[PDB]
Write a protein that binds this DNA or RNA. Sequence first.
DNA 1: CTTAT
DNA 2: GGGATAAG
DNA 3: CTTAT
DNA 4: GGGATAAG
Lengths: 242, 242
Amino acid sequence: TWLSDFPQAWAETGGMGLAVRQAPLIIPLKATSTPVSIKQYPMSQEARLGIKPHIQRLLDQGILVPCQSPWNTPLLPVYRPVQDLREVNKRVEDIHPTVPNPYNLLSGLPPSHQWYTVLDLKDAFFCLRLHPTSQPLFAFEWRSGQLTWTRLPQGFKNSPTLFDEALHRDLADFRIQHPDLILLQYVDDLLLAATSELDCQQGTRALLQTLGNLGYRASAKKAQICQKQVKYLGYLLKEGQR
Amino acid sequence: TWLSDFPQAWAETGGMGLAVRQAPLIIPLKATSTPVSIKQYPMSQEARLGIKPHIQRLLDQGILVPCQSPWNTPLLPVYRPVQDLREVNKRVEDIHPTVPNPYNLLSGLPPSHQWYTVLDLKDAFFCLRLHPTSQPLFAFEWRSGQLTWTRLPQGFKNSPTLFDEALHRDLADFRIQHPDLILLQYVDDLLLAATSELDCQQGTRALLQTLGNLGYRASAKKAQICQKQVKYLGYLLKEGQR
DNA sequence: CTTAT
DNA sequence: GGGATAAG
DNA sequence: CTTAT
DNA sequence: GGGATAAG
């Protein structure tokens, strides 16, 4: 099956990802920024007990580490943690947004290619390491002491663009080696298109092999493999329509 | 004095005006209009007693007359009567607004003419008769029976423009007979300008003579006669400035 | 008094 | 959207 | 919890 | 202008 033949490529079997070819990211601050330290508003026991097993799993995975930082932003009770990074985002230098909008992205899908595979990458931002100099930016309090992220965090304003650019670099060779395949990238949402079912099969095997090798992980549960009709970015792609 | 020499021209001495050269005005309705009859909301005794001597004076002057009309609009308690003519105005055909705005009107005052007389005409709209066919438009209730206006009423949307146009017709000959005078008309607010005090004096006498003869009446109390500096349309005209 | 802004 | 406001 | 719309 | 709302 597709699962057993690519155990490294699937999140279900290959473990948490880590983009091994990507240098740990340095996050430049705006020219005038200084650290901001916001007090953690006290969390109810109910919310703390809800968040706790997630924090422990992230610590075990090395995605969170203890630290002491002049930066601090609060965790919200939503349970699983959401960080209010708005004051950090204001202090980080802006980058040009290079993620295309889905409508324009789908224009690059010609009617000759009608065999589709759709993959979504699991915990995509966590696959990108943060440089130790930038890790303290994202610190928060956990009860006492601070923790921070060693990977690109949720809620950081530049994570979608940085991830899209990183995966484009890592898949550039795949594109060159398979010039007859169409590969659309929308951050962690991927579409591969081919002319024949065989070509889609061969291309999907190469893409999964490459993704796992690079340290990314796709969701086996949600994968749509070598279908004539798939759901991608909120569209139903059928008959070459939409 | 200016008062004693022109007893017909001043409202204080000449009685209520009546523009004897102007045909009674016919007020055209919009193509689809039918009469509207709005119930008089009951008025307090205090407001009725306040309004009463004004109604009696207007009846004595012939400016109000009894009538029966399919039109009716309410009187408001403000005492002296104000009519809510909004539903009548909506049903009357629009006319082009030809009254100039004061800023543009004052542009026509050259620096050569710096001797000024300012007159304001008293009860100006009441000087214009309404044709009997149009009188029922403006009916209201007075306690029981209806009254209506035999002269152009306050609150009617076209009264300023119709009055301005009427007085322009009545003063056209005055302008031709005094080509060296500047005469600005803003509805009932008049400015006469001349080069010398004598010319202003002579021109003011001719203008008052003509106004009284035509049936208009100026306020002696407010008249500014042959001054180098006057208040007109909210401006202070001094040094040829403003 | 109701009604446009 | 509504109540404070100005105006007929 | 705070805060932009 | 403020309270209901969505989002970090």
